[PDB]
Structure formats: C-alpha cells, structure tokens
C-alpha cells in the first residue's frame, strides 16, 4: 500500500506542476523589463544600538516605528528607543539561547524563546513598572525559532519540532497546531490581515497556513536548501523567502509559483533575514557575510548594499512606516539605516 | 518643552541604570566559560553532567550544570529536548569557550558516527574557531572489550591492522599493550580529523576518561585555560 500511496503522491505532484506551468505564461522579469530601475539605493547607518554582550539573534520593530526589541544569546531582551538610541528596557532571560523575539502590535507585551522550547511572554506595562514574565507557553518539543504576536491574546510560534502553533496566551494552551513541515520551521510571517501566515522550514519548502482553520492552504518548493527567512509582501498576496542556497525567491499566493529569484554569482552564503520596504519595491536580505543586500523586488537587481556589521547579519526588520531598517548582527551590534 | 526635557532626562536615567546593570552582566558573562556537551546520547554526557553536579540539570530544554574549578566558573550545557537534526540549533553555540565531545570509545559500531559528528563540528562555518575537549569515555569498557576480544576494531576500522602505537603514548600502570594501541588508535582517528583542517584557529584536547574518573573537572579547566591562552596569544599578536 505504501508504493501505491507514494505513486499517488507523485501523480498529484506532477498534476500541480502541470497546473502551475499552465498558469505560468509570462515572467515577472519579462513584465517589469519596462519598469525603470530603482537606482543605486544607498542607506546610511544613522543609529548604532550597542549594549548587547553576545550575538544578536532576533529583532522586531514596534508598531510605533520607534521602539525596538532585540534578543541576544547572552540572555537579554533590550527594548531600545531607536529615535534617541536609549535603552528603554533590559529583560534578563532564564535561558540565554533565545533565537526569536517578538513585539506585540499594542506594545504591551514582548515575546522570546529558543532552545528551552518555551515562548516567554513579558508584560512591558506592569503597574509596578518592572517587566514580568506574564506567560510561559510550553508544548513545543523543539527550539522556538520564531514567534509573532497575532494580538495581545494570541501568538503564532514556529519551532524546531517541525510544527507551528497558535497559542492563546491567556490560557497558555496551544489552541491550534500547524503540521506538515518536514524540517525545522525556521521563520514565520503573519499576513497584514493576520488571517493567514507563511512558514519556511528546513525542508526547502514554505507553507501557507490559515490561522482560523489550522490547515495548510498551499506549499511552495522553489528553494534548494533550508529556508532561514521569510517575509510577507506588503500587499499580502506574495512573500519572499531566503535560504541557505544563497538565493531569495518571491512566491505569489494566487499564482502559486515562483515569481522571481534574487541571487548573484558572487554570493555563496545563506540568507539569514529578509524584509520588504513599504511599497514592496525593495527586498532587504541579510547574508552570512557582513552585508545586507537590498534588491529591486520587481527587477531582481541588487539595488544596494548595507555594510558595517563585523559579524554575520542575523536579523533584519523594516520599520512600520518604512523610515528605517534595523539590522542586528552576530557582532552584538544593531544598526538603524536610513 | 519643559515636560519633553523631563521625559528625555528620565529616559537618560533609565538608560544609565540599564547600562550599569549591563556592565555588571558583562563582567559576570566574561568571567564565566560556556561549554557545549556533545556526543551520542547513549553514552557519556549524562554521567559527566552528574559528576560535575556532584563536584544544576533540568529536564525541560537544555540540561545546564554550573560548576567551579579553583575560582573559575564553568557553565556546561547538554542540549536535550531537541530533535535529532543538529545543523540549525548548533549555530547558536558559535561563541562557547569549548565543545566537550564525549565518545563511547568502547562502542566500535557507533565510533564512525561519532567521527562524522566530530568532523561536522570541526568543519562547521560557525564552529571553525571553537576548540573541542575530546572525552573518550568508557575506557574501562574499552579495556574490557579489548581484553575479551569478542569484537575487533579491524572489523569496523580496517586501518587498525596496520596501526602502531605512538611513541609519545603514556600507558597507565597495569595496562596491556593491546588496550593502549586500541585506545590510541581511537584517539588518533579524532586527532586526524582535527589536524586535517583548522589553520591553527582551534585545537582538540583528547582525554581518556571513565565513569569513576573524578579528574574531568580539572581536565576541562586546564583545556579551557589553554584555549583562552591561545586566544590571548592570537589577540596579543604573539600567536
């Protein structure tokens, strides 16, 4: 029966390949050949946020576009005021290897998690003025690789146990489990309407999940190696994906196919983080080298370079109003670019 | 803008308090050495962690053990509660002082898997500069297997037939030459992997140890002392 089921799966894969080929008529590059190049976009390091002891592993902007959260594997979550470079908060973590941090859209809470397989939710607006662990979500059997606040009560966390999970923070219970990934889920990206989210894993495939249902809507298998980064397009109808194969790829949810591949012959290092600008014209991706390349997302041209990190760029985030880009690296430094 | 100035001053005061706490944390963080316990889960790591604790654990997530040798603090982390895929969560240990690699030397069947794991650790992009303290554990079991002769290494390692014990080998008293040759061949496999690449940026410190061996803390202390001596010499341009 195993042979028959495998043959049926192969037939279904061939069928979806044929459907995608039939729907694929033009090419994004062919269509955008008439679009003028975005030019040499060069950004300046307008802030350097220093104070972390160990490598910065994660980053997240606040909705106000001014407050930042950074996670460092020394066991710290630092809330920075990016405008005035001050440190708003410094939260010591029970486990040092925190691989992900999240900022609640309301700014009341901050999430973190890592090798302890636990998502720690910290209340930033306690009455006494301190930061307390408001919740300790457990239930993942692998390391917490990503977490994104759906709201103050719901959080989506991706884990190294090849599963994602929608948690109700008030009850501390895993309300929904998203399964289907074969490798460790390394990245997670909520849609702008938060009805869907895409997760990239180590099986070289990304999956679109319905939050309210728990079923995987679609799977995208363009990459060749582990997916480390993933970001929704501002429209919400597409997303970019960075992998260890030194390429980024754009997948459209409705087209259900690769639209563009952003890669260069001289870059042979994996992509650690990806992000889009406000209009989505620019795709910012940090690499295992000391650099973050910004790409014309419609033209696949490397528009510019952000250099200035001593070690590999670990985290990358474009602020909500698009004024700046925060890149955190393994040299314990976080830089704002504008 | 008096209120704005007051808010700015309050933010500066909070940042100054946070920076003072961060300097204290930097002192504590740099004063202590982080060790990553690696090796097959079937033999060695848990017993070594328990021995350090006798000299503090935790099933949920990583098993952490803090011990102190002389006046120096070592924090050893056995990464349990994780899936069998090591390639992603191990990049987070790129800055540890040392990786303590425990090998069941008596298990010839799993010796090649241990060698492959050691090669992956040695040649990993983010572990290129990390030294490995190699604990060839279960030396009593290895001696028992060699003396009994039920299973021979030449069955699993054909090059053992042509192997001769090194001239610098230091057999323990009452140790037959066969056990010494087998032990040093098993050590020399890892040492060959270690010396095949590295460019001198990291070193492998092999030790023959057992369960009843209480010297492991001193061995780790001495090896970390040499690791940081090499780091200083590279930093001091003395190399």
């Amino acid at each position, epitope marked *: 029966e195993l042979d028959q089921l495998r043959q049926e799966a192969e037939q279904l894969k061939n069928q979806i390949r044929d459907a995608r080929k039939a729907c694929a008529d033009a090419t994004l590059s062919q269509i955008t050949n008439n679009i003028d190049p975005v030019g040499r976009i060069q950004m300046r390091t307008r802030r350097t946020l220093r104070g972390h002891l160990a490598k910065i592993y994660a980053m997240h902007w606040g909705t106000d576009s001014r407050l930042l959260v950074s996670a460092s594997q020394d066991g710290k979550l630092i809330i920075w005021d990016s405008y005035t470079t001050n440190k708003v908060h410094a939260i010591p973590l029970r486990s040092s290897w925190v691989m992900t941090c999240a900022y609640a859209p309301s700014g009341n809470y901050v999430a973190c998690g890592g090798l302890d397989n636990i998502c720690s939710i910290y209340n930033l607006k306690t009455r006494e003025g301190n930061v307390r662990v408001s919740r300790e979500l457990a239930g993942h059997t692998g390391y917490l690789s990503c977490c994104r606040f759906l709201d103050d009560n719901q959080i989506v966390t991706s884990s190294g146990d090849t599963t994602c999970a929608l948690w109700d923070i008030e009850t501390g219970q895993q309300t929904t489990t998203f399964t289907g990934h074969t490798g460790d889920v390394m990245s997670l990206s909520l849609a702008p309407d938060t009805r869907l989210f895409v997760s990239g894993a180590c099986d070289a495939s990304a999956k679109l999940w319905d939050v309210r249902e728990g079923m995987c809507r679609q799977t995208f298998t363009g990459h*060749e190696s582990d997916i480390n980064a993933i970001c929704f397009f501002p429209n919400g109808n597409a997303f970019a994906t960075g992998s*260890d*194969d030194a390429t980024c790829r754009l997948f459209d949810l409705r087209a259900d196919q690769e639209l563009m591949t952003y890669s260069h012959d001289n870059i042979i290092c994996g992509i650690t983080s990806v992000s889009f600008s406000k209009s989505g014209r620019l795709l910012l991706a940090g690499y295992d080298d000391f650099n973050c390349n910004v790409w014309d997302a419609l033209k696949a041209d490397r528009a510019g370079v952000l250099a200035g990190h001593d070690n590999r760029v670990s985290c990358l985030g474009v602020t909500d109003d698009g004024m700046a880009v925060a890149t955190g690296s393994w040299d314990s430094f976080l830089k704002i670019w504008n | 803008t008096e209120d704005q100035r007051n808010e700015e001053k309050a933010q500066r005061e909070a940042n100054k308090k946070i920076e003072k706490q961060l300097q204290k944390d930097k002192q504590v963080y740099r004063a202590t050495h982080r060790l990553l316990l690696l090796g097959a889960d079937n033999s060695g790591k848990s017993t070594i962690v328990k021995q350090m604790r006798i000299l503090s654990g935790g099933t949920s997530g990583i098993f952490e053990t803090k011990f102190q040798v002389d006046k120096v603090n070592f924090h050893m982390f056995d990464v349990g509660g994780q899936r*069998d895929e*090591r390639r992603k969560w191990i990049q987070c240990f790129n800055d540890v002082t040392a990786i303590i690699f425990v090998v069941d030397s008596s298990d010839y069947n799993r010796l090649q898997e241990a060698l*492959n794991l050691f*090669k*992956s650790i040695w*040649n990993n992009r983010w572990l290129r500069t990390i030294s490995v303290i190699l604990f060839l554990n279960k030396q009593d079991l290895l001696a028992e297997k060699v003396l009994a002769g039920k299973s021979k290494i030449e069955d699993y390692f*054909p090059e053992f037939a042509r192997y001769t014990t090194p001239e610098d080998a230091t057999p323990e008293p009452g140790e037959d030459p066969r056990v010494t040759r087998a032990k040093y061949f098993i050590r020399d496999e890892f040492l060959r992997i270690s010396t095949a690449s590295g460019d001198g940026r990291h070193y492998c410190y092999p030790h023959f140890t057992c369960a009843v061996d209480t010297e492991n803390a001193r061995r780790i202390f001495n090896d970390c002392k040499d690791i940081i001596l090499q780091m200083n010499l590279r930093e001091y341009n003395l190399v």
Partner: nanobody
Amino acid sequence: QVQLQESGGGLVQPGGSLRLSCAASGFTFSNYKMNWVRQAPGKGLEWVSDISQSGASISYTGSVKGRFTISRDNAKNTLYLQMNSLKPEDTAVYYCARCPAPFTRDCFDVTSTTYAYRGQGTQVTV
C-alpha cells in the same frame, strides 16, 4: 522541489557486485557534497560513504572502505555506489543524502529519523 530517486538493488547473492544509482533534481548537484547512507533492518540509519562537490575527497565507512566505491557524475547529475563485494550484513535500505548547504565541508545529515534532503531509498538484500 528537491528530489533524490534511487535505483538499483534487489536480491544479490553474497560476493556479487551491485551498482546503486541516484538521480538528483531540484538543485545544482555540482555544488553539494553527496552521501550514501544505510538503514539495516532494525538497526537505524548509518552513514556509508560520501563524495565532495568536485568528485574528489571520497570517504567510506570502515565496514565497506575496501569496496563500495562512490562516484559522482555532475554532468549527468547522478550519484553512484558500486558495491563490488557484497556481504549478508550489507542487506539494508540504501539512501542517497544531500548535505544541507552547498559550499560546506560539514555534513550535518540527520541520519536517524527524518532528513529532508534524502531519497526514498532502495532495498538491497544479500
């Protein structure tokens, strides 16, 4: 879509020679280190051999290193394992595994349990 399809296997008398092949797709295959891995009945996945990107730096496990020569055809995008002398202990499912990242000397394949860039395997009974 990364795919590794293994062919060759079946019943072979002891002392026989068998050429396992693996067709690779979904990746360049000229910039990846390739491996042959083995799962004996009731034993678990065990690494057999590996070959570097350029085809040099071949290495074998001790139980087969006098045989089981590994080869790689980047032009044909295939991997080969020629098992010249075969033993009853070689009866196992042979998988072709790809190292997770292209330009790396490390080979962090998760042999046991599930590995993404591994084939479905071919059964070899001796």
